[model samples]
Target: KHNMKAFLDELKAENIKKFLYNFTQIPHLAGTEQNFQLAKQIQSQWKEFGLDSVELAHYDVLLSYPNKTHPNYISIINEDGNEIFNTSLFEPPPPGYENVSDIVPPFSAFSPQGMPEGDLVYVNYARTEDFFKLERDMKINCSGKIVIARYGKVFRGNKVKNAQLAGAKGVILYSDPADYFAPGVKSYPDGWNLPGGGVQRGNILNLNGAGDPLTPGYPANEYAYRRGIAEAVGLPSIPVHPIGYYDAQKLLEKMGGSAPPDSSWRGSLKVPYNVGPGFTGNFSTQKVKMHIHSTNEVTRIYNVIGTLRGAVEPDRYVILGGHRDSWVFGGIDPQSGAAVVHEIVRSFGTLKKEGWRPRRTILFASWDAEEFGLLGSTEWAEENSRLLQERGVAYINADSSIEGNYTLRVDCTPLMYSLVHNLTKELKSPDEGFEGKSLYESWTKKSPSPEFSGMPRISKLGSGNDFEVFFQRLGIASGRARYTKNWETNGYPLYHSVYETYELVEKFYDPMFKYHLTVAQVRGGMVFELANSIVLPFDCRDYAVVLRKYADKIYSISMKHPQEMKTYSVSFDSLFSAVKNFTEIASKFSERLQDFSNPIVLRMMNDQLMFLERAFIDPLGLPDRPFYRHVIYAPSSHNKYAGESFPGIYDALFDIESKVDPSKAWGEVKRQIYVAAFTVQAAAETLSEVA
Candidate 1:
């Protein structure tokens, strides 16, 4: 009975270390030769693990890269175009990287290649709200200036979007000391925090939509309907480059403008923050020359999928996956997840050899091109949307499954409340000095629940990971579990930095790889239970309870602004009634779950629960992001990286704060409210016991 857990418990730290080290020793960017070779490498490994079936799903995605000849750089030059200082192209890890070539220089992927010259303006975060404050509070405009914005809070793509629309010439992104520095930790090689030359590299082209930039709403495979390269909607026209705080400090210290309007806008440098139009003192006549050069190509990427067919319910499935690509040597990003997934799947294979199998099928996936904005997963999901929509039971995404030496953090569906509640109690704690204790105790101590107090707070899923398409688009019961430091400056200082190598993970993050093994056990336990449970282990009452809070929040916001209800005359009466109806149906549905001896009763209830999330999808998704289809929960319109409940309501709420006449967009508010109401009502109907 406990054999599965016992087998998974044997996942060795050294085995995980081997997996992490093997994948991270080279740079395996999506659509690159190394990554494709890595896919073949994983394919062979899975076969050796004795999986029932293994195959690769390939896509011809449009990917981006930095040019080798004239790499992206930021230089402070005089008005005569004489270089004063040139930024470093890349920061290699200390103690040698050994024969690992093609360590691409840091550059914003999908940003247009150009040299935009202008005075540097110190925008705090370049968020839409920041731009409004720049116009109102700071009395400074971003027009005709190259904005040097720090990283943190907002996604870089959205920051660039705000800057370009504000008429900025270009964007220079840097990681501020305030964002990356920990109080007790030293720099990389000494401790985990980033060094002076550490720069974060990522895509700035997916603001318009997620997945492949060239092909929207469809998979980028053979006979795929590809859009014109120039006609791609999401990419930025201006050059955008990212540099380390080392260069950022040089620009900030020599700024020539008014002091920062507020203290919050200031960062952790000795020099005072200012809204600079140009350099000060000796360099007053100079401007920051931001040079960004990147090449784009339509190339092939792979998604390695291996399946273990169920003896009883082969039609149903549970998928556990993480990406295999990296921005550089992705030791922390996907490699941690990669290592964890490999170990768990091998455990499953061993179980198969022991003549054991679950009731339902389990699919193991290694996603590619995830770093380029969920390209591989999105394409796969789109290619088989209906197949997955019907059979996919639960999706567990394991990217960065183990990051820091901290408590477990879970972002998932409310339906899995009971599932997570029981699993954590069963697993051993991974935190230091917490050996022989349950992870449940560790989680509660750190982040005690606001509602339950005795329990740890479970979070909602955000769109920065591979779960985006499955949860946000297909409306599957998806979740991401990882070990994370608490949010008191838990910025993962080494994230996307060159220093994210096997050495740092082994020495700093998880010494014994206990956290890595714990995360793998957590994910494996989830797959095990979901694949075997007869009643599907979903709690609709939990979903119903969370819906009420989300609905209540809508009324609270309307009262604050007084525009949505008072001036615009938008009504939430129907929305409120729908939630009440859902709550009533959920109460009755929970009673039906207690006794389900009949096979017919079992299938009916599971079917109802299976399509429950899909009821929230609105074919035409959230305003700008068509792939994000969940009306009840999707990534926030203002900040795509963050999750929003009652997303349609929040979508209109975002417009209310930003628009001058919130009345004009009131129609959207009404439509969104109705849409949310309609979706919730339909979900209730899906679970209706009488129907």
Candidate 2:
């Protein structure tokens, strides 16, 4: 059914070709001036394409979130009184920590903040065991002193979190020369190694907390009552940073008192990877004043929203959204998806002019401030949740789809099964002669049957992208679409780095601009069909199957790891049976939907087709980190950069405090599962009434 060749032929037509040539010129990135420029450019293009007024939805953001250019930082010196290193304090910091002097910041720019001067002690990666053993043996009093830890044992955030528990005032993380960016490790682009002086940068935002620093629970609107920068809850209280192997190497050489590191902690570095102070060495650090700056611009940010007024259920809607923002010359990060989104808009815009209309309205949104953690869409979703829930059906998100990858990853949504299944038949593989295959089938072909390939699990939505608020927090059924064949195969060494330039885009990744056009034609076509069809295409059976599996995974964990789950209380399985039952009950009401002769049922389904994405929303939020409202997926708390499925319980008990408190863990798990189940039931009832 997927005739990729047929789609490509039309996409390559001269008119579309000319449009792509101009589309590629728009510069998009998050918060950068270029991002705003690209949005304006696209908005103008949207109007030129004969669409309605393409307005810029402007919102004020804190100037301090992005600009921090502190001058003074930690200064480190050896026993000989010679300064060894120094770091900056201009980044996000954990709470209530004193500033230290003459110490190099952690290798990464996003380390936690703190300053406490004490005897130097070495700890292996700072795992729970390392901390416990150090405390038990009195091997080191970490109080007011700095602990030099290596990366790779646990998540960087976990490493910092663990250090806080051990009474360490400051943290220094260095990439091991043997594994990370050390000198001879083969890298990417020019070479992928943490080079001699290169430092790693990241945030300890406890990502599970709310997204914006100033606004905790509410949308970060202009009139939203926000907390002062210092009072913002959930920010990392301590100061932290990363250094290269070169800086770490010098520090290790000066340590005394500790034996060489535990055998398991040894690294590939030529020097002894030791937990120090055993052999007797001296290390000290000092630094100057901290540098801080505000990164606010009164520039206009854009949200390019376009709509196709529906014919049948004109008030109902299906929203397709993706951001149009990036850091610098963001050709790859957002432009890839944003370009495709614009293409989708263009194609639909063309179809509209040709008199093609859908039954349910289709909203196409090109968001702003996505790179700054779902800013544009988050605020919008928050501001319009009631209106959206009342009229919106489904949301599909496509962001930075890579080139050359061959797998189809549907971040597990039951509502998506039929929609995806329907679209797959009409899709032609980016590869030669490959018909569009079911996402499940395609997934198994690439990997073994063991770990990830067997089951259909709902993908958890997390912050960092737009889908978080839509699917996870706001209870919308959402899925991210993209072509991963190229990126997964060749690896985008330029991801988030400076290499994501238009030059590279013109050479490789989505170079033909055909993919975006394809996305436009295919997904836009689906939206058209779904809107006009007499019967909704959703298949509840598939949802039941996926839910059962997720339910079991969550339930099994609650039963099997009682101690571990205490800290992480949310589980997906708890509500599986209830949701499955709701689907069955919904089936009985099919006539209500099929009796399309009645306007109300049809309108409800048309408006609420977004049911697919709402399955992951939770109202009470996750344990310990209430800011994260989505139970299904959120950025991993451990790394703040990576995504985790059902992040609440999955990550809760995985840490040292399995014995701390079981109620907290179970309470959060139950809360999330309940929320997910409730959302499913609401959708089922809505569908049942129509069916």
Candidate 3:
């Protein structure tokens, strides 16, 4: 019974390094030849491991490719009507690197093909709130202007989308040196910092839902239904391009107007940061031209799935997965995580050779096209929604695993808080001289804030990684773990760039590969426990506590901002009361869960527990965003990367836009709250039936 833990301890660091070296030998972008080849390789390896099933699940997805005929070009014209500088918008291959052709163009994915040109307006960060501040306080209008924004604080796609919503014709996104180039650190090619000419390419698809752009709420399989390109809600309607800091420096130096009103607007760049359309020195005309030509094509993507059938319960599933595609060499981004996943699977295979089997079925998945907006996983989940919703217990995802060695960070559902804490206490730290201390002890000693008080604070899962669909759309619990060191504080310099290669991973981040082994243990242990437990190890009371806090937050915000809540009606009392009732029922259920004497009784209770998260799903979905069905948890409309508690109520409480009818919007917000409350009450009733 306890041999499972012993098997977990056998994970080796040498195997991870060897596998990573082979896997990242070439770039594997989505919809490319290398991408399919890597998927086939993974599938073959899994088959060799003697898994019950190993197959390459394919999907026909709509993706964008750069148009070489009319390559993305940017030009800055002087106030004197003279061409100051002009350059193509494609990222060049690093010095001494082969296969320059593998480098993708620096165009925002899914952006409309257009060459609209106008005066450049600088909107710092270009977040939704920043736009509101620029319009309301600074009295700036972005209509018909080409907005230039720095990429930070929000998704780059949101920057373009927000600018377009504000009437901007086109958008130019650049990475600020202050954020990427840490003080006293040399730029890439020399050190880990981002160099002046490095471009960060990314997808701009609206992440309201994941999967194929034209196939909303469904799969993009051979016979699956799909919408037309014009009707697709995810594609962008503006021309957005990402440029290097050196190119941005030329453009920003030419801009002359009011200096940014706040100190927060300042960056590490040597030039003065200003919010402006043109300079006031000699002339007030800062003309710019941006031409982006892209082709949208429906292509095939693959998801390599391998299953190890359980000896006891083959119908129940515990899944572990990670994306295998990258923007470039992806040695650090997906490859790092991919390598860790391969090692974990190898360890499991080793156990199988020793005649060990899990109690519940375990599936290993290598997802594709995640960088293009969680395509492979979302499509697969959409295709298998019914099967996953019925048999899937939980999903464990790892994207970019070893970014730094500072701390062990995790984001998951509330049910996983105690499990993660308990596991960290048993695992030893990867740091030298701290070999005697457990990861939990190391984590507590370097507490990021006083609020944690030496406890592991598991963050809420948000839309970013492969877990988005499993947790947000299908109502399955999911979790992710990663190592961090000055991540947002100083920033990982080579994120999403060509420099995020094998060299970067070996040189700057996790040179010894100790953290890789550490995460493999932590993540692999979680999968082991979940797959082996007879009575699913879940903490429903913690879920209730988290929900109560979210409800209280909504109540507090409504009180603080009366004007924002003028038309909206909220029932915090009922919401709080429902949470309390749920807590009691859950506690009763937990008490009974310990008594697993009767197999029939245990199976019935397990069925109920599996569907508990589904209760949070409102079929009608979020207001104005039907694809985001989770009423309690979803990506914040303003900041898509961060999770919002009771997203519908919070989005409306802060929404001051004129497009929405106040009465209707308020009514919808109230409706979502009621739906969530009713669902919670029903869940309690369900527990009562079993308890």
Candidate 4:
């Protein structure tokens, strides 16, 4: 409560306001020219604040911008007197796919350059599974055909990847109003949300390996040995593009009869969504034979590493980081949270001015290229992995803030849960009186103040955000915290699109600035406390409990989505039983720590503390995806655009596990469970050592 009051006061004071000023000045769009410049400006300003070693780090990643002059650009439809149907060409065509007949260029971003017309075929949002099923069922042989799919079965890259897998010549992604722009889904002025017709354009790069697609495995440096575009194995094989739902609706409505789309395949369009070689539509497109004009850009993206080097434990470190780059105006995506870091810096600066330094070093990092996967953090973490493993205490990250309808959700390591619990206890909420109470308690208070129950445990980490590389692949005890409300919501319209601007932040989202101040105070204060904590605040009980939950989830998923499982024999009950037994043992271990009197035992336990998280790391690593090392979670290779939970086991369960010797099923399960079990042991050791 003492920290809570101080935290609120900090928010009220012009401290939070100063941080906002800093955020607005920097056009922190990730990867764009402006964003890269802002990185320098941030470093320069931070150095002026008198930090030691203010540095801007560089990565060897290929950078590409939207080029209007590319030869592989569209030829307009309205130019030609087209009769049958309206369509456009964006690229040149392959020999067999040549434009024997005319097709117009598409009015969408990334549309292929030129084409010969072929029969138009509709595939529902090309879910990878759906594509494969068509291949098996002999539904439609699109070997030389072009296909149209919807936006969200996966990332844009995956759509292209699926087309390649199906032997399709090219892919056109159309926005279906069911998801993006919904009618009655008011636009800004009415309601700043993305109306039904608004299209969402996104990158389709595979993240299993981050860098330029043309330069896989190697850094995208000029002199670096790299694969030729033809040699690159992971890049999607076909030309790809995305279009507004308006264009898609026009095509869908005119399609010639094939078959009505399945009920589930149906979208929000007034005309029925269908699986068609619709209207026997002629659609053809091809990529031009031109060199990709991309380079490493070689610019230094700065991470402001604010180090309040620990006094008694200077070697140990806790890194609190989030990216500084945004897609366009990344106010909500990062700058909103980035400003929180600045406020933390301001508060810490005041504390430092008042002569207070922490027990362990605190590093507040504002990363770059976070939008293009975890570019900055990955490069930094990989280059420094050895040093990090030796000394890093924990990592806490935050980004993309808005008023949500649920409690404060945490993606964390089990050992870190209790730390989250303790931190939440002292912090006030960003929503005024919404502070002080537990995230859950605060949420329930809105509807009907439920009984004042203790806080719920932290959830496992998933990859959608920037923590993909750190916790999932590198095996750090990393987490992301955000306040989302369920059932009750704060209506903030601007998310990823151009609307996520500075004006929007001032007008719609944080107009009052109270939420901004609260987030800064609570997050900043907790990070400081974490840096200074004496016993390294880890809890074994939480680790054991959470591990059991994950194990149960894996088994349940195996049962529910049996199609994804390698075998029908896999069961959840045994894993649950094992977890139950381990929990009891772990509980006893916790008790023993509270009473243990032996120094050697304590020392042994303390030594094991570091290895607890290391248990998540698989030394040999996951198959086909060596970059992913953590056994718990990973940014999936197949679904490389989104984060998957406990991806190691999940990947093995669905993709790789089936290929392994079925006879080794029990052994594989045991091996995975053993790795998880070690974490409980590590926590038990910490407790015993501390006692």
lDDT against the true structure, each candidate: 0.84, 0.55, 0.81, 0.56
| Model 3 TM-score (2 dp) | 0.96
Badly placed stretches (over 4 Å) of model 3 are 78-83, 98-100, 281-283, 448-452, 487-491, 562-569, 656-666
Candidate 2: residue 415 Cα off by (Å): 1.2
Q: Which candidate achieves the best lDDT against the true structure?
A: 1
Cα displacement (Å) at residue 657, model 3: 9.5
- Point out where model 2 deviates above 4 Å: 1-32, 63-76, 79-204, 207-209, 242-302, 403-406, 432-444, 447-462, 485-492, 506-534, 561-580, 586-598, 604-618, 624-691
Model 3 weakest 10-residue run by lDDT: 443-452
What is candidate 2's TM-score against the reference?
A: 0.74
> How many clashing residue pairs are found in candidate 1?
0
TM-score of each: 0.97, 0.74, 0.96, 0.79
Decide which is better by lDDT, 2 or 3: 3
Worst 10 residues of 4 by lDDT: 286-295
Write candidate 2's Cα lDDT for 140-224 as tens digits: 6676656778876355667777777777666777667544543443443334333455444334444444556566566666677
Per-residue CA lDDT of model 4 for 208-305, tens digit only, reads 64434444444444365655555543444455655555556766665554564356677778776656553534432211111121222334444456
- Residue pairs of candidate 1 with colliding backbone atoms: none
> Following a full C-alpha superposition, what root-mean-square deviation does model 3 have from the true structure?
2.2
Q: Is candidate 1 or candidate 2 better by lDDT?
A: 1
